[PDB]
Design a binder for this molecule. Structure first.
Ligand SMILES: [Zn+2]
Ligand SMILES: [Zn+2]
Ligand SMILES: [Zn+2]
Lengths: 86, 501, 553
């Protein structure tokens, strides 16, 4: 018989606007890109990861990389985009 | 003979000033210096090596004073001193053996003692000459980034990792300022600063989450030193975590004042809510919450959903700890354990014998993690039954005793350290590739058409303050950028690239 | 005019890459030979840099901070004033990022100023008011750091503001935050480096008056630390006040507080080291206090170790600088240290060992007193040589080596009790490479400075461990083993003296262990040279008893 006295837990918070999936492409964030999954395996498919921003928004690295070639704004909030994690 | 030569030179100066003409002074001094010094430089160099071998600072200072009169006579001394310092550093590192591969204190103290000794020698005897300082700097930079320890690890990135681990050991739970300053002096000679930055950030996050720091003043001083040495983005990244800690403290206070106007909870509850993009932690494995803890879970989830609308919380159960108090034993013991341990002890709350397969089904923990935590429990004499199988029988051991009422069982598992080190090294390599790609893209955006060698030179110039890139990696990044439709090879004029919109 | 206009057009391109590259190109142009004689471009460039200091991207902000350096060297003196004003007024802002980036930029600007008077005057005027404001702590700390940086270099330019600097600094030695006190102490030392005589006496008199009244325990420690720092930093200027300073510290030494005693002994050490001439009358009382508090341990009988460390370090400092004190040194200091070789704390033991090593180094009549004290040293070392700590045994071996180097024949009657310890350290799995090398060096020094007769009974015990050490995988051990083996060959059969010792049974072992190193072709150069020398000595001394191996050798 053991009794619990005190508990110290750690939690992380993320935006719930998107249901655990990319916003630019309608795919699960742990899966591959549309272009990556459509194309044959290559060096580009090796470097497919998840990129976070200062606004705590999560997209595929390739998705936001393609989005940034024309616009300099996060898709979900109108502020400028800055990479902070991979 | 050195003292004899100095005395003779003084006597000659006295003679020429007292009973000769003024026009003879320069020529007589030149001839005397020639005859007395320049003809014995071969002997002087061997004596210099011998005096360096057996520490004799006064003789070295006298010889520096003597040879400084001869034009271009100090170069050989500088080269010999640089070689001697390099050899001494290599020998000092080599004598520590294999133990220095997993002992940051020994490695850093050896380097620091060598540097202190030869800095003192340069300042005291050579009058802080620029060339001798440069020789000491080159020798230190040569033997810090390549030595016996780095050969064992087959990578020059072991030194920054050891330095960061030494800093973490220093800052964990008056003379600390001096050793921090000395460490920052060592940091200047390191070429792979990104490895140090990554390791320091990870260990600072671990320190902040678990609340084990010697003092906040030491952390502030180290942050100030990093401001002075590193850039401005890194310190901002650290300040983000420092701000999240305060936000979590305020939220804890608000939750505590909220619990008064409701039914109080049985246990003492504290939480650290952190942003998912500013901390190095990953998602936890599958885990079924113990039956005594859903109350706090639901209450805090409701409170957070009330105060913040569009956010969702993910719970890291591998970084959570707590207290278990036991009463069905010889005497009243209170023990500190992780959430996994608390879950896998309270499974047999009234039972006495389980099969690890049943324990796996009840706790929903994977194979390796459960095996490691069970081994840790068994080694603690708290539980009794080396290899384990799914049909192994493990039973609670009654009547165990310890010399102290307060016992902790949250000892780290051996494999996690090595796995974490490998993971962060791989992450560092991937980040290096990404920054090289970004630099190439930006340079091509600025200059529409540029050659190969100029591109490489500008890339190394831009990335020099963090690490020294390898040219094959730059070619690989260029090739992967060509495929991704970022830049294209122009027809004709081979080995030339142009930016493509 | 066109390149600069294009650069400033790009520096607001709404794309981070363009701004970064434009700022980098501007920085490269600034460090080059390009000059902008036009006074219309300078204002625009300065404003653009000061606005990019607040950019939304970290890289651009960092590059702008770095660009603030070369800008001041190639811009008229009017714009430097507005740059400094903008930075100083930004340090007082509510935004934390702006304050931090402005502090970094202001330190960078100060760094580039040649060792100028007007800008330093403005900076000092702003920072005095910044330090004076005690409402917030972060601004205080940043201002204190910048003031220390600005006083370390260019300190001699701002002579007129020294009264104001002292007046603003002095009240901060009482603030509830210890970081403020430490920064104030650093700034005060830097100020003492470049100051007039009036302010120095003002500071010393204020410190003495504040120490004369014991308002709080916390502040007294700060004042003692400040006095120690001032003494350590200035030196000669504080010597005239020791006659009044020392009795206060002596009175404070007797207070029952562990932290206070350590600071007092450190102040004593600083006085002993930095100013030698004015401490002559007080060496006796300093030594007596150090001896009294060297054995301070209330909760044990055969944080109280910090005072012991401080006392031993102060004794080391006293011994290492006074050469005329040697008779009374050997009269009183040496027995206490010898009796304290048995300290139960490793660090204090190491520091007392270092102190007695410094005494031995200074010893180079004192020799007769050292010879009389030798038996106690040997009796103390015999117990320490069997400890399980590598550092203690290393200290013992080093001190024996130094003692033999000072007195050539000091260990004639104690070889029977000293050889077993060396042997035990030689063949022990817990020993490290450094311990074995130190033991071999001690053995070599002992053998080189004594008559061969005293080692004859112990050759049978000394040969096997040395032969084993010759075959060690580590070459650094092998070199020292061969060096010891050469002297062992000299001892076993002397050539200039008659000996009745039989050297026959030990010839084969030495020859076999040396020949293998001699014919290696892949070992390090040092081992090759040592093997050649050792084999030459073997042939010279005992080459008559070798068989058919001589032609091949
Ligand atoms: Zn996507
Ligand atoms: Zn992809
Ligand atoms: Zn966003």
């Amino acid at each position: 018989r053991f009794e619990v006295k005190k508990w110290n837990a750690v939690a992380l918070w993320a935006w719930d606007i998107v249901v655990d999936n990319c916003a630019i492409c309608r795919n699960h964030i742990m899966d591959l890109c549309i272009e990556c999954q459509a194309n044959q395996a290559s060096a580009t498919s090796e470097e497919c990861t998840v990129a976070w921003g200062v606004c705590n928004h999560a997209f595929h690295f390739h998705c936001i990389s393609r989005w940034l070639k024309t616009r300099q704004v996060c898709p979900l909030d109108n502020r400028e985009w800055e990479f902070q994690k991979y | 003979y050195m003292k004899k030569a100095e005395a003779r030179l003084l006597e000659e100066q006295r003679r020429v000033q007292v009973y000769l003409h003024e026009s003879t002074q320069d020529e007589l001094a030149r001839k005397c210096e020639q005859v007395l010094i320049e003809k014995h430089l071969e002997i002087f160099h061997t004596e210099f090596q011998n005096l360096l071998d057996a520490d004799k600072n006064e003789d070295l200072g006298r010889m520096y004073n003597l040879v400084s009169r001869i034009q271009d006579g100090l170069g050989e001394l500088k080269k010999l001193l640089e070689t001697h310092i390099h050899n001494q550093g290599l020998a000092a590192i080599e004598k520590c053996g294999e133990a220095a591969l997993n002992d940051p204190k020994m490695y850093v103290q050896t380097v620091l003692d060598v540097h202190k000794k030869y800095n003192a020698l340069v300042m005291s005897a050579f009058n802080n000459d620029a060339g001798f300082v440069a020789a000491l700097d080159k020798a230190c930079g040569r033997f810090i980034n390549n030595n016996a320890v780095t050969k064992m690890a087959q990578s020059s990135s072991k030194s920054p990792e050891l330095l960061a681990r030494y800093c973490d050991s220093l800052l964990k739970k008056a003379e600390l300022e001096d050793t921090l300053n000395q460490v920052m002096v060592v940091f200047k000679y390191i070429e792979d600063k990104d490895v140090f930055q990554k390791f320091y950030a990870k260990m600072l996050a671990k320190r902040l989450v678990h609340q084990n720091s010697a003092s906040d003043d030491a952390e502030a001083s180290m942050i100030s030193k990093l401001k002075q040495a590193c850039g401005f983005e890194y310190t901002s990244k650290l300040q983000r975590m420092f701000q999240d800690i305060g936000v979590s403290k305020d939220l804890n206070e608000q939750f505590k004042k909220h619990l008064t106007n409701s039914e109080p909870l049985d246990l003492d509850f504290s939480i650290q809510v952190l942003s998912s993009g500013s901390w190095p932690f990953q998602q936890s494995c599958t885990f079924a919450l113990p039956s005594e803890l859903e109350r706090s879970y639901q209450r805090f989830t409701a409170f957070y959903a009330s105060r913040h609308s569009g956010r969702k919380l993910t719970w890291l159960y591998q970084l959570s700890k707590g207290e278990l108090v036991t009463n069905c034993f010889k005497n009243r013991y209170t023990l500190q354990a992780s959430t996994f341990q608390m879950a896998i002890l309270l499974q047999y709350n009234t039972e006495d014998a389980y099969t690890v397969q049943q324990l796996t089904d009840s706790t929903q923990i994977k194979m390796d993690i459960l095996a490691q935590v069970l081994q840790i429990l068994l080694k603690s004499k708290l539980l009794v039954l080396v290899e384990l199988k799914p049909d192994t029988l493990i039973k609670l051991y009654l009547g165990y005793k310890n010399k102290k009422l307060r016992v902790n069982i949250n000892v780290p598992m051996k494999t996690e350290q090595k796995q974490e080190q490998e993971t962060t090294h791989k992450n560092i390599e991937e980040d290096r590739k990404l920054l090289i790609q970004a630099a190439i893209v930006r340079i091509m955006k600025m200059r529409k058409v540029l050659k190969h060698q100029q591109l490489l030179g500008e890339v190394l110039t831009q990335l020099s303050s963090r690490f020294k890139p390898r040219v094959p990696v730059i070619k690989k990044c260029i090739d992967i950028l060509i495929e991704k439709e970022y830049l294209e090879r122009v027809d004709g004029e081979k080995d030339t690239y142009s930016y493509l919109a | 005019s066109y390149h600069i206009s294009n650069l400033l057009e790009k520096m607001t391109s709404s794309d981070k890459d363009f701004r970064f590259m434009a700022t980098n190109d501007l920085m490269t142009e600034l460090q080059k030979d390009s000059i902008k004689l036009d006074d219309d471009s300078e204002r625009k460039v300065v404003k653009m840099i000061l606005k990019l200091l607040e950019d939304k991207n970290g890289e651009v902000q960092n590059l702008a901070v770095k660009c603030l350096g070369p800008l001041v060297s190639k811009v008229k003196e009017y714009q430097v004033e507005t740059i400094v004003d903008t930075l100083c007024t930004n340090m007082l802002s509510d935004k934390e990022q702006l304050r931090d980036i402005s502090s970094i930029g202001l330190k960078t600007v100060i760094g580039e100023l040649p060792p100028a008077a007007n800008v330093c005057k403005k900076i000092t005027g702003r920072l005095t008011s910044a330090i004076a404001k005690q409402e917030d702590v972060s601004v205080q700390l940043e201002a204190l750091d910048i003031m220390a940086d600005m006083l370390s270099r260019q300190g001699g330019l701002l002579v007129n503001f020294h009264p104001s600097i002292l007046t603003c600094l002095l009240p901060q030695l009482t603030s509830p935050r210890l970081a403020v006190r430490k920064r104030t102490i650093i700034a005060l030392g830097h100020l003492v480096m470049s100051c007039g005589n009036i302010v120095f006496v003002d500071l010393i008199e204020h410190l003495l008056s504040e120490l004369s009244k014991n308002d709080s325990m916390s502040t007294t420690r700060t004042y003692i630390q400040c006095i120690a720092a001032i003494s350590r930093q200035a030196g000669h200027r504080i010597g005239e006040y020791l006659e009044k300073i020392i009795p206060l510290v002596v009175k404070f030494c007797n207070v029952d507080d562990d932290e206070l005693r350590e600071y007092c002994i450190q102040a004593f050490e600083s006085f002993v080291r930095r100013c030698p001439k004015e401490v002559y009358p007080h060496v006796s009382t300093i030594i007596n206090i150090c001896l009294k508090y060297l054995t301070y341990d209330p909760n044990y009988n055969y944080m109280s170790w910090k005072v012991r460390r401080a006392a031993a370090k102060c004794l080391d400092a006293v011994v290492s600088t006074r050469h005329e004190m040697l008779p009374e040194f050997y009269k009183t200091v040496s027995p206490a240290l010898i009796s304290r070789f048995k300290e139960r704390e490793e660090n204090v033991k190491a520091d007392v060992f270092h102190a007695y090593l410094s005494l031995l180094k200074q010893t180079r009549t004192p020799l007769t007193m050292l010879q009389s004290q030798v038996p106690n040293i040997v009796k103390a070392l015999h117990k320490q040589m069997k400890e399980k700590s590598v550092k203690t045994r290393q200290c013992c071996f080093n001190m024996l080596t130094e003692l033999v180097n000072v007195l050539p024949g000091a260990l004639t009657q104690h070889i029977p009790v000293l050889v077993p310890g060396i042997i035990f350290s030689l063949n022990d799995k817990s020993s490290s490479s450094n311990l074995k090398i130190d033991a071999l060096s001690c053995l070599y020094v002992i053998l080189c400075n004594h008559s061969p007769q005293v080692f004859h009974p112990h050759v049978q015990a000394l040969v096997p461990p040395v032969v084993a050490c010759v075959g060690d995988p580590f070459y650094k051990i092998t070199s020292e083993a061969l060096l010891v083996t050469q002297q062992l060959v000299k001892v076993i059969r002397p050539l200039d003296q008659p000996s009745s010792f039989d050297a026959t049974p030990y010839i084969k072992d030495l020859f076999t262990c040396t020949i293998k190193r001699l014919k290696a072709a892949d070992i390090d150069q040092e081992v090759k040279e040592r093997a050649i020398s050792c084999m030459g000595q073997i042939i010279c001394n005992l080459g008559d008893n070798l068989g058919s191996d001589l032609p091949n050798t």
